[PDB]
Amino acid sequence: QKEDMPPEHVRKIIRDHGDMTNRKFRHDKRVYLGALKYMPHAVLKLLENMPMPWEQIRDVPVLYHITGAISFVNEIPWVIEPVYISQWGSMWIMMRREKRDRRHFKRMRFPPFDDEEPPLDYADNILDVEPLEAIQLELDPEEDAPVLDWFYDHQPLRDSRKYVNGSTYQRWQFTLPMMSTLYRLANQLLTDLVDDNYFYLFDLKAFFTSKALNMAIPGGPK
Amino acid sequence: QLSKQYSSRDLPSHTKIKYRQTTQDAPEEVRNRD
Amino acid sequence: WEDADFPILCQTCLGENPYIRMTKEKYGKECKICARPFTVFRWCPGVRMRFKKTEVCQTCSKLKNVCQTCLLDLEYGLPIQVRDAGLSFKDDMPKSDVNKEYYTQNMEREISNSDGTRPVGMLGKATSTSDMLLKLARTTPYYKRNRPHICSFWVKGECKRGEECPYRHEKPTDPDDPLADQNIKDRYYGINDPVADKLLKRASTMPRLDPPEDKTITTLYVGGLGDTITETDLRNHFYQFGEIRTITVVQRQQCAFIQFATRQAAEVAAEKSFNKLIVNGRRLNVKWGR
Amino acid sequence: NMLNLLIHRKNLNYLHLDYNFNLKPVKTLTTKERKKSRFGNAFHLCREVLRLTKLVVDSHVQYRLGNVDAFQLADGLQYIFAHVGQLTGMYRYKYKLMRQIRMCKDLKHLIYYRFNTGPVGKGPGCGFWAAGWRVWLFFMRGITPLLERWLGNLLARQFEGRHSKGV
Amino acid sequence: RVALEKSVSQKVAAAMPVRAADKLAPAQYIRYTPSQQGVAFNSGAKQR
Amino acid sequence: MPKVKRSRKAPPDGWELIEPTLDELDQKMREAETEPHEGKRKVESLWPIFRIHHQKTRYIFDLFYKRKAISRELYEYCIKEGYADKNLIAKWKKQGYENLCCLRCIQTRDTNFGTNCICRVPKSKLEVGRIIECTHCGCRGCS
Amino acid sequence: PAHINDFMFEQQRRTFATYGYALDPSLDNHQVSAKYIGSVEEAEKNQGLTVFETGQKKTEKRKKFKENDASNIDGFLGPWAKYVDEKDVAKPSEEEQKELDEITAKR
Amino acid sequence: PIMLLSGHEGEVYCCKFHPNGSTLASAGFDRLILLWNVYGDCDNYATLKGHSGAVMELHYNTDGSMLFSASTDKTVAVWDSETGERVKRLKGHTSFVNSCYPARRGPQLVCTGSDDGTVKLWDIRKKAAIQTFQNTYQVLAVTFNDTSDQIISGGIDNDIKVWDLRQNKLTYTMRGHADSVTGLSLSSEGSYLLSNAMDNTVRVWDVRPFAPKERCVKIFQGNVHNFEKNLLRCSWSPDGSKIAAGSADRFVYVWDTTSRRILYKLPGHAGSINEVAFHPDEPIIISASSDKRLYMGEI
RNA sequence: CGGCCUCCGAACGGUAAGAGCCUAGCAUGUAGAACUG
Ligand SMILES: O=P(O)(O)O[C@H]1[C@@H](OP(=O)(O)O)[C@@H](OP(=O)(O)O)[C@@H](OP(=O)(O)O)[C@@H](OP(=O)(O)O)[C@H]1OP(=O)(O)O
Numbered sequence A: 001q002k003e004d005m006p007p008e009h010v011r012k013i014i015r016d017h018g019d020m021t022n023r024k025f026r027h028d029k030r031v032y033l034g035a036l037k038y039m040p041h042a043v044l045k046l047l048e049n050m051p052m053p054w055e056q057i058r059d060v061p062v063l064y065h066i067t068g069a070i071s072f073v074n075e076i077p078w079v080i081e082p083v084y085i086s087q088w089g090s091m092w093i094m095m096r097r098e099k100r101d102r103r104h105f106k107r108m109r110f111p112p113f114d115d116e117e118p119p120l121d122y123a124d125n126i127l128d129v130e131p132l133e134a135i136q137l138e139l140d141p142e143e144d145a146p147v148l149d150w151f152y153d154h155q156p157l158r159d160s161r162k163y164v165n166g167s168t169y170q171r172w173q174f175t176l177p178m179m180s181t182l183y184r185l186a187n188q189l190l191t192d193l194v195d196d197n198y199f200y201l202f203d204l205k206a207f208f209t210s211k212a213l214n215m216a217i218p219g220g221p222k
Numbered sequence B: 001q002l003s004k005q006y007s008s009r010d011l012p013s014h015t016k017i018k019y020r021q022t023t024q025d026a027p028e029e030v031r032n033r034d
Numbered sequence C: 001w002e003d004a005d006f007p008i009l010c011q012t013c014l015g016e017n018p019y020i021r022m023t024k025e026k027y028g029k030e031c032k033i034c035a036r037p038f039t040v041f042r043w044c045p046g047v048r049m050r051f052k053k054t055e056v057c058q059t060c061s062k063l064k065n066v067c068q069t070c071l072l073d074l075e076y077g078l079p080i081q082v083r084d085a086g087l088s089f090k091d092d093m094p095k096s097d098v099n100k101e102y103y104t105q106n107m108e109r110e111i112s113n114s115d116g117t118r119p120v121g122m123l124g125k126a127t128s129t130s131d132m133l134l135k136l137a138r139t140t141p142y143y144k145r146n147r148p149h150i151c152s153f154w155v156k157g158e159c160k161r162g163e164e165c166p167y168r169h170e171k172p173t174d175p176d177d178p179l180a181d182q183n184i185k186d187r188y189y190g191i192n193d194p195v196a197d198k199l200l201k202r203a204s205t206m207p208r209l210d211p212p213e214d215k216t217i218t219t220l221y222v223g224g225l226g227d228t229i230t231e232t233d234l235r236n237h238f239y240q241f242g243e244i245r246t247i248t249v250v251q252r253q254q255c256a257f258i259q260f261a262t263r264q265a266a267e268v269a270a271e272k273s274f275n276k277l278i279v280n281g282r283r284l285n286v287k288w289g290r
Numbered sequence D: 001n002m003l004n005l006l007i008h009r010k011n012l013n014y015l016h017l018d019y020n021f022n023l024k025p026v027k028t029l030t031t032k033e034r035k036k037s038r039f040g041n042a043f044h045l046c047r048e049v050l051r052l053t054k055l056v057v058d059s060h061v062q063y064r065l066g067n068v069d070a071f072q073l074a075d076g077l078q079y080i081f082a083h084v085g086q087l088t089g090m091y092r093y094k095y096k097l098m099r100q101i102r103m104c105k106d107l108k109h110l111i112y113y114r115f116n117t118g119p120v121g122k123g124p125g126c127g128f129w130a131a132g133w134r135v136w137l138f139f140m141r142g143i144t145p146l147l148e149r150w151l152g153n154l155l156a157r158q159f160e161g162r163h164s165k166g167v
Numbered sequence E: 001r002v003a004l005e006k007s008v009s010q011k012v013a014a015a016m017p018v019r020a021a022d023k024l025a026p027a028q029y030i031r032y033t034p035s036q037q038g039v040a041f042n043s044g045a046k047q048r
Numbered sequence F: 001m002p003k004v005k006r007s008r009k010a011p012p013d014g015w016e017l018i019e020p021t022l023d024e025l026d027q028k029m030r031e032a033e034t035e036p037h038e039g040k041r042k043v044e045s046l047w048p049i050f051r052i053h054h055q056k057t058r059y060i061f062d063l064f065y066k067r068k069a070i071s072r073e074l075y076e077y078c079i080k081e082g083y084a085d086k087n088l089i090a091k092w093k094k095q096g097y098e099n100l101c102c103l104r105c106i107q108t109r110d111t112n113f114g115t116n117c118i119c120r121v122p123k124s125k126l127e128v129g130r131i132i133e134c135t136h137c138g139c140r141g142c143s
Numbered sequence G: 001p002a003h004i005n006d007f008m009f010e011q012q013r014r015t016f017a018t019y020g021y022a023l024d025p026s027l028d029n030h031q032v033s034a035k036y037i038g039s040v041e042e043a044e045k046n047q048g049l050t051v052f053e054t055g056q057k058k059t060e061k062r063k064k065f066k067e068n069d070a071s072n073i074d075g076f077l078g079p080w081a082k083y084v085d086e087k088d089v090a091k092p093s094e095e096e097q098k099e100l101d102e103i104t105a106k107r
Numbered sequence H: 001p002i003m004l005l006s007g008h009e010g011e012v013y014c015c016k017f018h019p020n021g022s023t024l025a026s027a028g029f030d031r032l033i034l035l036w037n038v039y040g041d042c043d044n045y046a047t048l049k050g051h052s053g054a055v056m057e058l059h060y061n062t063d064g065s066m067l068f069s070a071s072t073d074k075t076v077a078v079w080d081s082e083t084g085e086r087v088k089r090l091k092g093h094t095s096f097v098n099s100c101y102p103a104r105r106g107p108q109l110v111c112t113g114s115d116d117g118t119v120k121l122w123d124i125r126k127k128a129a130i131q132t133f134q135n136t137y138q139v140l141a142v143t144f145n146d147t148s149d150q151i152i153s154g155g156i157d158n159d160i161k162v163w164d165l166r167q168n169k170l171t172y173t174m175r176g177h178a179d180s181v182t183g184l185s186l187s188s189e190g191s192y193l194l195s196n197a198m199d200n201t202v203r204v205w206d207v208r209p210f211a212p213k214e215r216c217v218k219i220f221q222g223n224v225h226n227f228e229k230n231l232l233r234c235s236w237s238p239d240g241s242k243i244a245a246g247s248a249d250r251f252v253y254v255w256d257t258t259s260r261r262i263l264y265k266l267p268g269h270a271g272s273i274n275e276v277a278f279h280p281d282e283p284i285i286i287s288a289s290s291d292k293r294l295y296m297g298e299i
Numbered sequence I: 001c002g003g004c005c006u007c008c009g010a011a012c013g014g015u016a017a018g019a020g021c022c023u024a025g026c027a028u029g030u031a032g033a034a035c036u037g
């Protein structure tokens, strides 16, 4: 099969070419150009796998052109639903308690760089530096035992065929201890409703009838 | 010499032909009629 | 653009091994003749010998009936200027940009009505391949063609890749030689090919039978007969080529002498026979006798 | 690199695209250059989408270079996504964006006016950027076929030529 | 109908231009009978 | 300054004796990486990278398999931290592929006719001894 | 459009390449015999062995090195190990070098 | 008509008719067996599955009910044409099984030639080997004798061999083949055996209570070999009248026993013909060729 | 027991058209290459 490579391979090609001015390359000129038609794919791919603020470094499969012209992050970011909700709920509590207990929050400046301050080299500048503690929240070892080690992992139970269908990361099965702890943790971003007799005249079908009759519910759309 | 230019209007659309059914007026009933 | 079955090139350009390997790319590049996209088939010429590629539109080829890689004619294999002149051929192919594009377009239209067997036009009504062309024609595959260039590194010293110099690391030719810079387009147009002028000088200095002075010298001495010949065989060499008046088969000197009944018939037989009238294998010399 | 190759292949030496993806002329341009150097919604929509992603990447670069913070990074990302209107200037090339921009204001209002339910203050310390992230990602789902078609046609017309023959 | 539809679908795939390309078909094996015959070229074989 | 370690879990306990070898190989990979793009060539400037990679993963291949001087769990940590090459190794384990230079040297799709590099044909079948330079690695008859 | 198999064509090509003679392939309606074409007497004296089929050759294998320890910091030529009877720098004759400088002047 | 058949992933190696001539069997590299209707429009219904290597020989029974098939993957296999599903996996064969031959109208048994160096007898019922004659080399062709008391074999020594099923030693060896033995076929006389060989010369013998002890009777010219060395297979007519052969020239060879003339050298093909099947009732021929198709000629 | 809260901006249409002129670029990277009694 087609097999992976050392990262330094591509890194070398790309820092080699730089900005295609050197008369050495001189043909990847036109191939580079022709690669423009897909630049909106590269961007959607890159931006839909961004690192989700509790992690400091996320690594992703990357497909790329043998002259460095383009680089598609070749990955679809699956997450487990209650996992995800619980993590973002942790984020919610952390952000609120923090901005409450912080003396003055500073707003960073955009653009973060200057206009002719060229983009920095990853390896030569950012490869080795220390990645700066993230937005981890501290879960209680008795209260939150059934998760305590695997919570903030990029893909938490990626490798345990007791929990995940495989290395494709689908079809999860979970324990009720796990579930009740998670529920308690994502308690903040959640609805304290038990049934649907709340949404009596406030559901999709009521809205469809309204829309059709040009009438408007007090608190509904028009 | 077939170009790669293209058009918003030549995108695929209406890709099935509605055939004239039995009740509307098929060429069969036209075969019959007086 | 065009679409092909396989290339058209001589044996020299074509190869030696029984199994040839060539890769195809549809609409690969531009025939410097038809100016438009063509198909490109790339053939592995020989062991460590430069991979060649198809270098002209197949219609640009069927036009003049030459080699789409080797560039020389496919019947004889001499410069196209030569081969044309050896048929006395005079093609009116247009040259200017708009004129040439119009010509190419109607040419492809007219060639579309062909069956893919033989070049179009005067290429058949000039098919009297003259012994001049036959004699200027090369005999064996001059397979020096698939040797690489002069590895400019290896000409200055630099070719530090070991033996893998991409080019023959020999002494570069002094471009003062007229056999050096022949622009491919000119070589195709039959436009001042110095190699073709060399073939003209060679086929001009190459031996042919000489004419005598007075018309009444109608005796023709054929030198180098041998005693396997008959008078009727000398006749059947020079008999329906006109009429013969007499023949003296000199066995004390191994020659012959045809007194003719038509001077132009004598000329036909003898001049066509110069050193090449090979009946039963003996090199006779056709001249006009004393 | 792609966009610069496009300019300089079109032989527009008097324009230069800088590193935040602003296009800036280095001379005063005559008419013939003012005209030859005009660009359309394809070129400019890529330019501005690239500018959005570059702002995102570079907030992340600031964080990993170590200047800022996890909290400052999250709040900055929240900013970027809510205020795409006044950072990029994409609306001028696809004014159907204001669908999205109104959606991100409505989210901002919801999130903030539930976020400061208690002592929490109404100031910068709020980065909860799931929502606007979703929004602009769906926008991208939609825009990629459109931009692929427009840019294929731009490039085709650039390399073959425009067919004024059989219009 | 047949010949029509084939030429249709080629001209239609022209309006694909993003060809979701199919891969390269099986390799061609062709027997070539040169018109040039002679013991010296092709090193003495009458076909390639 | 090293390949900064992600797992946050402590490396198992044979790491300390491959330690300086791994560190040095990383340092000279860095140096041969920034080694700038001379009048050298463009096809040939991507050989040293595979040289250093194959170098390192061969080192670990010995130190787990041919010596058994290392623990399974250590060597697992040292692949998952990107020093070794799990696929290169799972092929190296084959019968004819002990010295396969670069895992691209057997990619059948990487070549127009559907073969491998002549870098893979054993030299006895060649009999011509002409120096063989597989463009990708530059390598010299890995097999 | 003849149809053939390939593995035998590849064996034939390996032979025709490295031994220099080939099983003549002409499929004439005149029933020829299996004949060695190319370096005829070479195939005859070699008993026809193809570059793939094992057979004994006392041909000197070109002089090679062998450093197979990947523990060496600057060591492993490994799969890339140079042949030891090869030169260091492929420098072409001083003569052609001076003549090449002169010609670069001449143009 | 012409009636060229297709649908095969690769070259067609083995083809024969129903011993009725009702449905048709063809197969080759593709590791499955295609079956057809011979008549009508030459329709293609069913495909047997399973055989791991190229199915090196299909062999009917003589009534037309059971199907034996020797595949290169170390195994012979029995199948029910009624179904298409395997009745036995005759394993134990240590290497490439080329040939299989089920005894006609005798008790249930097969003699199998292979790439091991043995000739093997096996029973359909026991999953057990009955005998094995190791001469020394791989066995390429096997045909019984019409008493089912001798086994005929063609291998790599050009020396056509026959074993006594009861005395178990080399009963008949006859020689005169210029090179390796590639195809054996017992005529409907029960007596004459037909043998092809790449050496351009094909031979007939007669295995009787008495034959002249040098029984090379009739010889035919034209068969070709090339650098391919593909398998070569031949047959008699159902009437023992026309000699049917294929070869690597793309010419199907049709001779007669009587005047041994060339009755036909038929072109049409693109691939080397790897098997010719004569129809048990009709003047119908199916030419299985390496051009990944078939022909059905009417003569 | 009452709840009802549109919008939002960019381009073309204005600051001539030209032939010459001259020189970077930008493209090419090829094809071929000699003869006798
Ligand atoms: O135009 P916008 O991009 O959306 O942002 C601003 C601002 O936002 P930031 O805090 O994000 O810089 C405040 O919004 P809130 O923070 O209050 O939600 C503000 O609100 P006030 O000035 O009323 O404090 C204002 O609102 P408006 O422009 O209607 O006066 C408006 O936010 P919105 O535009 O989202 O309203």
Ligand SMILES: [Zn+2]
Pocket: F104, F105, F117, F118, F119, F120, F134, F135, F136, F137
């Ligand atoms: Zn290689």
Ligand SMILES: [Zn+2]
Pocket: F101, F102, F104, F105, F117, F119, F134, F135, F136, F137, F138, F139
């Ligand atoms: Zn390699």
Ligand SMILES: [Zn+2]
Pocket: F100, F101, F102, F105, F119, F120, F134, F137, F139, F140, F141, F142, F143, G079, G080
């Ligand atoms: Zn190698």
